[PDB]
Design a protein around this nucleic acid. Structure first.
Lengths: 1177, 21, 100
RNA sequence: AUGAUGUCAUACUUAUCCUGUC
């Protein structure tokens, strides 16, 4: 079983985000750091949207991302700290749309070790040196200096290790071109490890040590060091030198203390909290992230707290020292992992969970009534900051991507044939039920019904220099309608077309002249009021036409071709010859003229005899055949386009065949576009020439980084389409529907999979699909939370305690506190507690966004498993059994008891009625039907329970589990239970004696998170360490039986995906293709594993991967085999993402790899695209 | 490779047909 | 190595000085002491290459001509990411051979 | 009947090494 892993949707969760002039121009870029891929974003200052400029997979876990620039430079570098033992300096090359590695020096071994540097990386603000240190006992500082040819060069690194010392966070000090210092939070654990009494473990606070790097001595030494009052989580580098005083702000729990080095006194300020907070008072408050905005006049800081309270941090200072720290709450934001303050009022909010946000710095945060707690302001009591809406920034854009690794069910719940990916993703109040469909979002800007039966649509501008269209032509069956698009589009008659007849084509020939194509003749309309007519010769009529930028080809009846040439004086000149064809013309195509050239060379003409022929339009070989190509069906439409150009041709059936643009016909490709005639329409998508198909599904083909990408439209089918450009619609497409006109536009680039999210209340765990009701039953449970009735009781207790102060008693803040309900999705969820939880069961229809029913659990109730099936003792009534736990949290708090509630699923799965709630001694984490009964796994006890009138009667029990049953997949004959730290084992259930016997086990333990049965003896399971494994039972294993087990199961496939997988499903993503092992990720990524059908193709893919591992190394300095062999060694796994870089790599290296593979680079591209077309959308 | 390639083309056929459905 | 089990390496901090190999010890690896599969170049320490200590061989210690490289078997075994393997000590080798 | 220390040959390995000098 040789498989081939492929990525369908990249990871959208960002772990780090930097801002600066990475492109070397005045525009600032946003370098985002995903899980296993690097991303370069460029926000539009006019449009307010963030576009992905580049996206490259680093094939490794990047743990640090920082930017730096030398003195007097104009471009910011990119320092990337990954899990490898090498430091990589990257320099994005715009003149190539790729990140060029400047330097790469190895420092240690691979892996996320404690003694391996790469976890922390600080850069100097002057760009003189960079410091990379590990979590403990390792620290290195390399010097960066420019060469004579302005090239960045690195020197030998300086070792600065310290034994038995742990580093929390490091940051470089802002020095005015002096000796650079690197401040970091240190903690000596030597005394705590040599004291069994535990006295040395207590009273051991963190010590802020500032290590200075002597440039004259070429060595670093710990110059300054001072202990702190409390433990710190992160630091904030204050700019010094000419702009502000030097120093750093140390963030801590409920306190902030900026303590500069030297004679500067320590000034501390407590963290302000929200007024009348519903959270627990015993829990502290720390900062989550911090942003710095530096200007020539002054500088400010923006740090978000644990509740997402973004406060505007300001520091009053004297001539040489700091006076006080004045903080003020700017607005309210979600929990963001990184914040980037850009120029011209732009704030990028990269959320740690859920969709991201990009608030633009609107207000300065000052000049308001908001109370700004100063550092000098004494308090013995913390400035209770009020939760005021962010009235200083405006979300310019949102990157709501993936970061869940929760649950996903890929099924065709809708009426369409293509299955949708119903994936519940989110965290707490930001959770949502997103149904992902592979398509494209169409934004209908205008829609108006059209009389009669329209057959075509056209849009021609007034001038060649005009940036927008001016005339819109609608061709009916017996006439033609022309409209003028000036933001008030109505019926127009003075255009000069005189549409009393249906029109075949309408475009602009000259710079300001128009050309209309009719079967009764040709009509030329210049800039002035002049009509140049050209009637058809004889009684024949024009069947088809082909217009261009400087060419006009027309086809009459009987295969009579007529060529018209555009004179440089502005007139049209007909050809001196008429070429005849062997059959009638059914399709004609004319490519656009180049800006350098004056005319097009190739002209495609489709015949009725199922054959395509190319005709040269040069004056040397005009009306001469160039290349012929047979077609399996009658052609319907043809269109040639650039990106290196290819000519597409659509047939009358649901299939189309394309060919390259050359003097001879080269490679060919085809796909089932169908039960509809495939028409070809040219469009402008993202500033590039794209093709728009007209069939039962409207697919838009567009190339993306030397790789084609064609997704269908998520709308109704259309008959004709044309590109549109106006002031209201800058980039749109006018599509003609059945007796209706619709002006749509494709704003979002949803080529991967478009999603529609239905929001939930808490973090979901698993979802169940009802067979008869066709609905979704998802349970949303989250720890450290309270229920709705518990929150209402806490609010009532707070309102009772607020009136207990007896303040003149006469002040009623309860009417403003209890009535005002703050949104948990926007202003954060006020939830706390150690053992408290909040579970909620809700049944919602997948077609709509509303929920049919909702069931709230108890206060200390937390559901972990859910199943919906029927009982053998009962009739056809589907029962929904959901197991919950009582008093649970983490490993320190041992689980108390458990319960299993039963639902009736009344009104054909529209309402749930609680029948019984059977308790349990252990927490149930497994519920699955098995031969009319329900298998209940509570802890390490696997019990088979039956349906009872009072409680679930357990008919069987099995205590052979190692630690705890985490998952259970039941085959028709056997049962496969998945342990927590042990690998899954196969167990046979005897129906005669009601005794479950384990007949197979595994030899290697793995922290399994999800699994799926591939066959009767082969099972594939995920790993918590970011790997994927597939175990197959041996054929000599005896299921009838009575270190741990005798029969062992061999692992036939193992591959480290690098992301936490929690959902696996083997199904067909597209009808007609092959089924693949589609897997989800916790970082918002979707992947698919496809098995190899041919041994020669598998060997070719293995040779291509072996060539690519030597020709294109990863940018993170790690090895591909070492990344694939992180947890388990690779066995029959081919990474298609590394093979996809052959089109993005160098052309000479691609030609060398193709010569080593004895093929062509387009042949290798076609062989790579064939597996994707066979296995994916 | 070539013989397989002949087969490969057929393989493509199935997927294309699937798309049509 | 092979040629000498009592020899000790320098294992100092890695600098920017590229290592070199003598004409008598050309092609031989430093750690693996092999002749095939060169994958990574040899980097010398800063104190090991200064003045008259520059341009000398790492293993042989004589006049270096060509640049030395590490074996691919030592590169895949992470034996090349250690310190500078400059031969500092010289014991039980080329001592009694000078007398004869 | 192993094992022990012991004076004394004999094979084997290290791709061991022969122009080194003030």
């Amino acid at each position: 079983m040789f498989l081939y892993n492929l990525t369908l949707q990249r990871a959208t969760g960002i772990s780090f985000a930097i801002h600066g002039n990475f492109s070397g121009t005045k525009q600032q870029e946003i370098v985002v750091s995903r899980g296993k891929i690097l991303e370069l974003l460029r926000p539009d200052p006019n449009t307010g949207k963030v576009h992905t400029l580049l996206t490259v997979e680093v094939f490794g876990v990047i743990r640090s991302l920082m930017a730096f620039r030398l003195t007097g430079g104009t471009k910011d570098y990119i320092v990337v700290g990954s899990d490898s033992g090498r430091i990589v300096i990257l320099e994005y090359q715009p003149s190539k749309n790729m990140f060029e590695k400047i330097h790469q020096e190895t420092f240690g071994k691979s892996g996320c070790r404690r003694i391996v540097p790469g976890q922390f990386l600080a850069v100097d603000p002057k760009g003189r040196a960079v410091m990379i240190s590990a979590i403990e006992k390792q620290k290195l500082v390399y010097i960066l200096n420019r060469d004579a040819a302005a090239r960045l060069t690195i020197s030998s690194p300086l070792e600065a290790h310290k034994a038995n010392t742990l580093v929390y966070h490091v940051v470089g000090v802002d020095v005015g071109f002096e000796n650079p210092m690197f401040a970091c939070l240190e903690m000596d654990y030597e005394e705590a490890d040599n004291d069994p009494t535990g006295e040395a473990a207590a009273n051991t606070q963190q010590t802020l040590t500032f290590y200075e790097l002597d440039l004259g001595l070429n060595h670093v030494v710990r110059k300054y060091s001072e202990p702190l009052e409390e433990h710190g989580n992160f630091l904030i580098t204050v700019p010094g030198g000419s702009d502000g005083p030097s120093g750093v702000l140390i963030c801590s729990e409920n306190y902030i203390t900026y303590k500069n080095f030297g004679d500067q006194p320590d000034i501390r300020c407590p963290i302000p909290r929200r007024r009348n907070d519903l959270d627990d008072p015993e829990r502290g408050m720390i900062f989550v992230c911090s942003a710095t905005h530096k200007t020539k006049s002054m500088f400010f800081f923006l740090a978000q707290t644990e509740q997402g309270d973004i406060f505007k941090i300001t520091l009053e200072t004297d001539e040489d020292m700091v006076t006080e720290i004045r903080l003020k709450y700017f607005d309210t934001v979600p929990v963001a992992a990184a914040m980037c303050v850009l120029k011209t009022g732009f704030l990028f909010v990269a959320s740690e969970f859920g969709n991201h946000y990009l608030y633009q710095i609107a207000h300065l945060g000052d000049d308001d009534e908001e109370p700004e707690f100063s550092s000098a302001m004494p308090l013995e009591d913390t400035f209770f900051f009020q939760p005021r809406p962010l009235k200083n920034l405006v979300l310019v854009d949102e990157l709501d991507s993936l970061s869940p690794i929760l649950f996903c069910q890929i099924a065709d719940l809708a009426n369409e044939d293509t299955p949708q990916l119903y994936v519940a993703c989110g965290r707490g109040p930001r959770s949502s039920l997103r149904v992902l469909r592979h398509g494209l979002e169409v934004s209908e800007m205008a829609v108006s019904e059209l009389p009669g039966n329209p057959n075509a649509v056209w849009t021609v501008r007034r001038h060649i220099e005009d940036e927008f269209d001016a005339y819109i032509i609608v061709s009916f069956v017996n006439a033609t309608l022309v409209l003028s698009i000036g933001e008030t589009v109505e019926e127009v008659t003075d255009s000069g077309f005189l549409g009393t007849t249906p029109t075949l084509s309408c475009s602009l020939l000259g710079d300001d002249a128009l050309v209309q194509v009719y079967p009764d003749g040709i009509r030329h309309i210049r800039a002035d009021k002049r009509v140049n007519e050209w009637k058809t010769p004889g009684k024949k009529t024009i069947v088809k036409c082909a217009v261009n930028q400087r060419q006009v080809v027309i086809a009459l009846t009987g295969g009579e071709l007529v060529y018209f040439e555009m004179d440089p004086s502005g007139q049209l000149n007909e050809y001196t010859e008429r070429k005849e064809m062997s059959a009638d013309v059914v399709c004609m195509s004319l490519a656009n003229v180049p800006p350098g050239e004056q005319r097009s060379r190739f002209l495609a003409v489709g015949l009725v005899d199922n054959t395509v022929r190319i005709i040269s339009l040069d004056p040397s070989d005009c009306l001469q055949p160039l290349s012929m190509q047979a077609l399996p069906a009658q052609p319907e439409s043809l269109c040639i386009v650039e990106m290196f150009l290819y000519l597409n041709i659509g047939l009358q059936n649901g299939v189309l065949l394309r060919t390259v643009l050359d003097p001879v016909t080269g490679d060919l490709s085809d796909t089932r576009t169908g039960s509809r005639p495939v028409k070809l329409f040219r469009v402008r998508m993202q500033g590039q020439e794209a093709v728009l198909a007209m069939s039962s599904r409207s697919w838009l083909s567009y190339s993306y980084q030397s790789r084609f990408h064609l997704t269908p439209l998520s709308y109704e089918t259309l008959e004709f389409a044309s590109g549109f450009a106006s002031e209201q619609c800058p980039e749109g497409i006018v599509a003609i529907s059945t007796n209706t006109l619709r002006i749509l536009a494709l704003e979002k680039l949803g080529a991967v999979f478009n999603q529609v999210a239905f929001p939930l209340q808490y973090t979901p765990r698993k979802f169940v699909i009802h067979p008869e009701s066709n609905n979704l039953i998802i349970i949303e449970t989250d720890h450290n939370a309270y229920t709705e009735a518990t929150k209402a009781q806490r609010k009532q207790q707070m309102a009772e305690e607020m009136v207990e102060a007896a303040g003149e008693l006469a002040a009623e803040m309860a009417a403003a506190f209890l009535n005002e309900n703050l949104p948990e999705s926007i202003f954060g969820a006020p939830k706390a507690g150690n053992g408290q939880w909040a579970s909620v069961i809700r049944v919602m229809n997948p077609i709509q966004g509303n929920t049919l029913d909702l069931v709230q659990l108890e206060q200390n109730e937390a559901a972990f498993s859910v199943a919906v099936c029927r009982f053998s003792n009962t009739g056809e009534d589907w029962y929904v059994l959901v197991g919950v736990a009582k008093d649970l949290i983490l490993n320190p708090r041992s689980v108390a008891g458990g319960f299993v509630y039963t639902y009736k699923l009344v009104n054909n799965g529209e309402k749930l009625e609680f029948l019984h709630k059977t308790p349990v001694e252990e927490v149930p984490a497994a519920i699955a039907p098995f031969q009319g009964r329900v298998l209940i796994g509570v802890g390490k006890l696997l019990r088979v329970y039956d349906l009872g009138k009072k409680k679930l009667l357990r008919k069987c029990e099995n205590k052979h589990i190692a630690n705890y049953i985490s998952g259970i997949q039941t085959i028709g004959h056997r049962v496969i239970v998945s342990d927590v730290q042990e690998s899954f084992i196969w167990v046979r259930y005897k129906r005669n004696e009601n005794q479950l016997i384990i007949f197979a086990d595994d030899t290697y333990p793995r922290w399994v998170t999800t699994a799926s049965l591939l066959d009767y003896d082969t099972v594939a399971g995920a790993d918590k360490f970011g790997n994927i494994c597939v175990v197959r039972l041996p054929p000599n294993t005896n299921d009838e039986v009575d270190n741990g087990a005798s029969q062992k199961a061999e692992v036939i496939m193992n591959y480290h995906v690098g992301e936490t997988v929690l959902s696996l499903q083997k199904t067909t993503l597209i009808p007609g293709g092959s089924e693949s092992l589609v897997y989800t990720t916790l970082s918002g990524g979707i992947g698919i594993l496809v098995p190899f059908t041919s041994h020669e193709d598998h060997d070719f893919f293995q040779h291509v991967e072996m060539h690519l591992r030597s020709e294109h190394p990863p940018l993170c300095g790690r090895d591909h085999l070492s990344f694939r062999s992180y947890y388990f060694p690779v066995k029959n796994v081919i990474d298609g993402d590394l093979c996809e870089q052959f089109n993005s790599m160098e052309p000479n290296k691609q030609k060398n790899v193709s010569e080593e593979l004895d093929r062509t680079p387009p042949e290798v591209s076609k062989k790579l695209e064939d597996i994707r077309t066979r296995y994916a959308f | 490779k070539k013989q397989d390639l002949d087969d490969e083309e057929k393989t493509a056929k199935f997927i294309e047909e699937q798309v049509r459905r | 190595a092979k040629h000498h089990p009592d020899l000790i390496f320098c294992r100092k901090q890695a600098g920017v000085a590229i290592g070199r190999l003598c004409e008598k010890c050309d092609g031989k690896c430093v750690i693996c002491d092999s002749y095939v599969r060169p994958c990574t170049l040899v980097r010398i320490c800063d104190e090991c290459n200064y003045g008259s200590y520059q341009g000398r061989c790492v293993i042989c210690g004589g006049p270096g001509v060509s640049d030395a490289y590490y074996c691919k078997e030592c590169t895949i075994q992470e034996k090349d990411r250690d310190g500078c393997p400059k031969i500092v000590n010289l014991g039980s080798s080329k001592t009694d051979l000078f007398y004869e």
